C-alpha cells in the first residue's frame, strides 16, 4: 500500500504537470507572516473572537487533515518549529466553486500555501481555543509523493535525517542548541579581540594531535596529502607572525572507529592567546563553559542521561565555579596506593614494567603497543570515570604531551589540563611549548615511541620547528570538542544525535 500510494500520487501529480490546472510545482508563494510570529501576534484573541479584516498568508507542511461533512475541513500546518491550525468553512472560501476541487488534491505531508483571516476557535468539548487561519484560498506548493509513517528506529533516522526532522521536532531543537553553543564561543572570543582564521585542511604532514589521518591525492601536482587531525601547528605559526590572539572553529579528520563519542569528522574550537598560561586558560575555561550553560540551559546544573539501555539513569552535571582540580600523578598514587616514579623517569623501561604490573594486576587491558604513554593513559581512565562535574585533570607527563611546555616547578610534568564531564573529555589545553631545543627532544621521544609500534605518534614538522626558532612568545593554547559539548547541553547519549548527517556504516 505504501508503494501503491507512491505510484498513485505520482501518476496524479505527473498528470498535473502536463495539464497545469493546479500546477503541482508552482514557483513563488508570498508568505505574509511566519507561523511563530502568527501565533504570537494573535495569541491575545479570546476564545471565539475573530478579525475578518486581518488578512494573512502563511505556508507549511500538512501534518494532519480532517473533514466533517462536505462544507468543513481542518488542517494542521507545521512550520518553523510551530504548529498552526487551519479552518476552512465553505462560507469563508473565495470562489466556492473551486472549494472542493482545491481541497481534495491536498494530502497529508504536502507543502501548501493558504490565505484567510485570523480568529480563535471555540471547541464545544475541550475549550482553550486555538489561533487559526480562516481559509479563503488554499494552494498546493509541493506535493509529498510518499506516505509518511504513523518511527522509533535509530540508524534509519541517520540516513534520512530529513525524515527524522519532519516526524519528531525533538531533533530540530538540539541542532539549534548546537548552533547556539558555537555562536556563544565566537562571542566570547570576539569580545576579547580574537581573530577568526582558517588554516589548511590538506597538509603534507598532519600534526597537532595523536591520531591516524586520512590520506588523499592531488592529481594536478601528483602529490599525496593528509587531511588535518588538528590545526594546532598552524595556529602557533600565526602567533609567531604577530597575530597574538587567534581561534578557529572547523572540522577535524581522524581515521578511527565510530562510537558514542567519536566520529571520523568532527568540529573542534582551538584558540591561542599570547602572554597567557594554563592558569589563565583554566579561569577562561570555567568562566566560558559555566556561563554558557546558564545562558543556554537557564541553570548552572544539567540533568544528563548517559545510558540508552537505562534512560532512568540520571546524572547531575554541576558547572558551578569553582571546578574541581586534581593533579594526575598525585591522584594516580592514591588510586592504586603506590608511589610513582619521580616524573623525569616516567619514560624509562623500568617505569614501563611498573606500569604493566599495575595493568595486569587490576585486569586492565591495554591494546598494544604498550608504550609508557598509552599504558599511563589507560590508567588515567580510572580517574576520568568519577569525573561527573566538569573537572580539571592537571599535570600530564612530558612523554604524553610533545607540544605542552614543561612545568616550572614539577620536573617531569607539563603545564597541561584536560576537562572531563560525565567521564568524557570535552577540552584539552596547555601552556604552549615555545622552546625549540626542548621541542626537538619531545619530537625525538615521539619518534622512539613510534619505533616501538605507536603509529599515531607526532613526528617532527621542520617548518613548525623553524617558526619556534624565530620565536613563539609565551602563549596558552586551548581546544574543545564542539560535538561533545552539544551532547551534554542537549541531553544526547551519543554523538550521532548532535550531528546532522553522521558518518554512516553502510
Ligand X SMILES: NCCCC[C@H](N)C(=O)NS(=O)(=O)OC[C@H]1O[C@@H](n2cnc3c(N)ncnc32)[C@H](O)[C@@H]1O
Footprint of ligand X on residues 220-279 (CB under 6 A)? 230, 232, 254, 256, 262-263, 266, 268, 270
Q: What's the CA gap between 497 and 306, in Å, rounded? A: 13
Q: Does 42 bind ligand X (CB under 6 A)?
A: no
The only residue of 208, 397, 412, 502 in contact with ligand X, by rule CB under 6 A: 208
Binding residues among 342-381 for a copy of itself as defined by CB under 8 A: none
Choosing among ligand X, a copy of itself, none, which partner's interface includes residue 50 (Cβ < 5 to 8 Å by kind)? none
Binding residues for ligand X, rule CB under 6 A, total: 25
Choosing among a copy of itself, ligand X, none, which partner's interface includes residue 268 (Cβ < 5 to 8 Å by kind)? ligand X
Q: Is the separation of the CB atoms in 489 and 177 below 8 Å?
A: yes
Q: What's the closest the beta carbon of residue 216 comes to ligand X, in angstroms? A: 16
Q: What's the closest the beta carbon of residue 421 comes to ligand X, in angstroms? A: 9
Binding residues among 268-327 for a copy of itself as defined by CB under 8 A: 274-277
Q: What's the closest the beta carbon of residue 217 comes to ligand X, in angstroms? A: 17
Q: Does 461 bind ligand X (CB under 6 A)?
A: no
State phi, psi for 295 to the nearest 5 degrees: -65, -40
Rg (CA), the chain: 30
Residue 262: asked if its preceding bond is cis (omega within 30°), the reply is no
Expressed in percent and rounded to 5, the helix, strand and coil fractions of the chain are 35, 25, 40
Choosing among ligand X, a copy of itself, none, which partner's interface includes residue 338 (Cβ < 5 to 8 Å by kind)? none
Q: What's the closest the beta carbon of residue 452 comes to a copy of itself, in angstroms? A: 21
Residues 6+ apart with CB under 8 A from 320: 290, 300, 301
Long-range contacts of 459-466 (CB under 8 A, 24+ apart): 459/205, 459/207, 461/205, 461/207, 461/233, 463/237, 464/207, 464/233, 464/236, 464/237, 465/436, 465/439, 465/440
Q: What's the CA gap between 204 and 460, in Å, rounded? A: 12
Q: Does 465 bind a copy of itself (CB under 8 A)?
A: no
Q: Does 376 bind ligand X (CB under 6 A)?
A: no
Beta bridge partners of 304: 315
Choosing among a copy of itself, ligand X, none, which partner's interface includes residue 463 (Cβ < 5 to 8 Å by kind)? a copy of itself
Q: Does 484 bind ligand X (CB under 6 A)?
A: yes
C-beta closer to ligand X: residue 93 or 304: 304
For residue 27, with 0-12 CB atoms within 10 Å meaning exposed, 13-18 middle and 19 or more buried, which class applies? exposed
Q: Does 483 bind ligand X (CB under 6 A)?
A: yes
Please give the DSSP secondary-structure letter assigned to residue 414.
Answer: B
Q: Does 181 bind ligand X (CB under 6 A)?
A: no
Choosing among a copy of itself, ligand X, none, which partner's interface includes residue 11 (Cβ < 5 to 8 Å by kind)? none
Among 426, 434, 445, residue whose Cα is nearest residue 406: 434
Beta bridge partners of 57: 115
Q: Does 240 bind a copy of itself (CB under 8 A)?
A: yes
The only residue of 39, 51, 90, 182 in contact with a copy of itself, by rule CB under 8 A: 182
Binding residues among 140-169 for a copy of itself as defined by CB under 8 A: 141-146, 148, 159-166, 169
Q: What's the closest the beta carbon of residue 340 comes to a copy of itself, in angstroms? A: 24
Binding residues among 33-72 for a copy of itself as defined by CB under 8 A: 59, 61
Binding residues among 194-233 for a copy of itself as defined by CB under 8 A: 195-202, 204, 212, 214-221, 223, 227
The only residue of 2, 5, 8, 17 in contact with a copy of itself, by rule CB under 8 A: 17
Q: Does 505 bind a copy of itself (CB under 8 A)?
A: yes
Q: What's the CA gap between 218 and 224, in Å, rounded? A: 6
Q: Does 491 bind ligand X (CB under 6 A)?
A: no
State phi, psi for 318 to the nearest 5 degrees: -100, 105
Q: Is the separation of the CB atoms in 380 and 393 below 8 Å?
A: yes
Choose the binding region for a copy of itself from 123-131, 239-247, 286-294, 315-323 (rule: CB under 8 A): 239-247
Q: Does 479 bind ligand X (CB under 6 A)?
A: yes
For residue 281, with 0-12 CB atoms within 10 Å meaning exposed, 13-18 middle and 19 or more buried, which class applies? buried
Binding flags for ligand X, 426-455, as an x/- string (CB under 6 A): xxxxx-x-----------------------
Q: Does 83 bind a copy of itself (CB under 8 A)?
A: no
| CB-facing half-sphere around the CA of 19: CA atoms within 13 A | 9
CA 57 vs CA 24, 27, 35, 228, 352: distances in Å: 19, 16, 10, 49, 73
Q: Does 411 bind a copy of itself (CB under 8 A)?
A: no
Binding residues among 86-105 for a copy of itself as defined by CB under 8 A: none
Binding residues among 282-301 for ligand X as defined by CB under 6 A: none
Choosing among ligand X, a copy of itself, none, which partner's interface includes residue 405 (Cβ < 5 to 8 Å by kind)? a copy of itself
∠ CA 239-242-245, nearest 5°, is 55
Q: What's the CA gap between 350 and 227, in Å, rounded? A: 37
State phi, psi for 479 to the nearest 5 degrees: -145, 140
C-alpha cell at position 141: 506548493
Q: Is the separation of the CB atoms in 229 and 208 below 8 Å?
A: yes
Binding residues among 470-489 for a copy of itself as defined by CB under 8 A: 470-474
Q: What's the closest the beta carbon of residue 269 comes to a copy of itself, in angstroms? A: 13
Choosing among ligand X, a copy of itself, none, which partner's interface includes residue 436 (Cβ < 5 to 8 Å by kind)? a copy of itself
Q: Is the separation of the CB atoms in 139 and 102 below 8 Å?
A: yes
Q: List residues near ligand X by CB under 6 A.
A: 208-209, 230, 232, 254, 256, 262-263, 266, 268, 270, 425-430, 432, 477-481, 483-484
Amino acid at each position: 500500500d505504501p508503494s501503491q500510494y507512491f505510484e498513485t500520487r505520482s501518476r496524479q501529480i505527473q498528470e498535473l504537470r502536463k495539464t497545469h490546472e493546479p500546477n503541482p510545482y508552482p514557483h513563488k508563494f508570498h508568505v505574509s507572516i511566519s507561523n511563530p510570529e502568527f501565533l504570537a501576534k494573535y495569541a491575545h484573541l479570546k476564545k471565539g473572537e475573530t478579525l475578518p479584516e486581518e488578512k494573512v498568508s502563511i505556508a507549511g507542511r500538512i501534518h494532519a487533515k480532517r473533514e466533517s461533512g462536505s462544507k468543513l475541513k481542518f488542517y494542521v500546518l507545521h512550520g518553523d518549529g510551530v504548529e498552526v491550525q487551519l479552518m476552512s468553512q465553505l462560507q469563508d472560501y473565495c470562489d466556492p466553486d473551486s472549494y472542493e476541487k482545491d481541497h481534495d488534491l491536498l494530502k497529508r505531508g504536502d507543502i501548501v500555501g493558504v490565505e484567510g483571516y485570523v480568529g480563535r476557535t471555540q471547541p464545544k468539548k475541550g475549550g482553550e481555543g486555538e489561533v487559526s487561519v480562516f481559509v479563503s484560498r488554499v494552494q498546493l506548493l509541493t506535493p509529498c509523493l510518499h506516505m509518511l509513517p504513523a518511527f522509533k528506529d535509530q540508524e534509519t533516522r541517520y540516513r534520512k535525517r530529513y525524515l527524522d526532522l519532519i516526524m519528531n521536532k525533538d531533533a530540530r531543537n538540539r541542532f539549534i542548541t548546537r548552533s547556539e553553543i558555537i555562536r556563544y564561543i565566537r562571542r566570547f572570543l570576539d569580545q576579547r579581540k580574537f581573530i577568526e582564521v582558517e588554516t589548511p585542511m590538506m597538509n603534507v604532514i598532519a600534526g597537532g594531535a595523536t591520531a591516524k589521518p586520512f590520506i588523499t591525492h592531488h592529481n594536478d601536482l601528483d602529490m599525496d596529502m593528509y587531511m588535518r587531525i588538528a590545526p594546532e601547528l598552524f595556529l602557533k605559526q600565526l602567533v609567531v607572525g604577530g597575530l597574538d590572539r587567534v581561534y578557529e572553529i572547523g572540522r577535524q579528520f581522524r581515521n578511527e572507529g565510530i562510537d558514542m563519542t567519536h566520529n571520523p569528522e568532527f568540529t573542534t574550537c582551538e584558540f591561542y592567546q599570547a602572554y597567557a598560561d594554563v592558569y589563565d586558560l583554566m579561569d577562561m575555561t570555567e568562566l566560558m563553559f559555566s556561563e554558557m550553560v546558564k545562558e543556554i540551559t537557564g541553570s548552572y546544573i544539567i540533568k544528563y542521561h548517559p545510558d540508552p539501555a537505562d534512560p532512568a539513569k540520571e546524572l547531575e552535571l554541576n558547572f558551578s565555579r569553582p571546578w574541581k582540580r586534581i593533579n594526575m600523578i598525585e591522584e594516580l598514587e592514591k588510586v592504586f596506593n603506590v608511589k610513582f616514579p619521580s616524573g623525569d623517569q616516567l619514560h624509562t623501561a623500568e617505569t614501563g614494567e611498573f606500569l604493566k604490573k599495575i595493568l595486569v594486576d587490576n585486569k586492565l587491558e591495554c591494546p598494544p603497543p604498550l608504550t609508557n604513554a598509552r599504558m599511563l593513559d589507560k590508567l588515567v581512565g580510572e580517574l576520568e570515570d568519577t569525573c561527573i562535574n566538569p573537572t580539571f585533570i592537571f599535570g600530564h607527563p612530558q612523554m604524553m604531551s610533545p607540544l605542552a611546555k614543561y612545568s616550572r616547578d614539577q620536573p617531569g610534568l607539563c603545564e597541561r589540563f584536560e576537562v572531563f564531564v560525565a567521564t568524557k573529555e570535552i577540552c584539552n589545553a596547555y601552556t604552549e611549548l615555545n622552546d625549540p631545543f626542548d621541542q626537538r627532544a619531545r619530537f625525538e621521544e615521539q619518534a622512539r615511541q613510534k619505533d616501538q609500534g605507536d603509529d599515531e605518534a607526532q613526528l617532527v614538522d621542520e617548518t613548525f620547528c623553524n617558526a619556534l626558532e624565530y620565536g613563539l612568545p609565551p602563549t596558552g593554547g586551548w581546544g574543545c570538542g564542539i560535538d561533545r559539548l552539544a551532547m551534554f547541553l542537549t541531553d544526547s547519549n551519543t554523538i550521532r544525535e548532535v550531528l546532522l548527517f553522521p558518518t554512516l556504516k553502510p
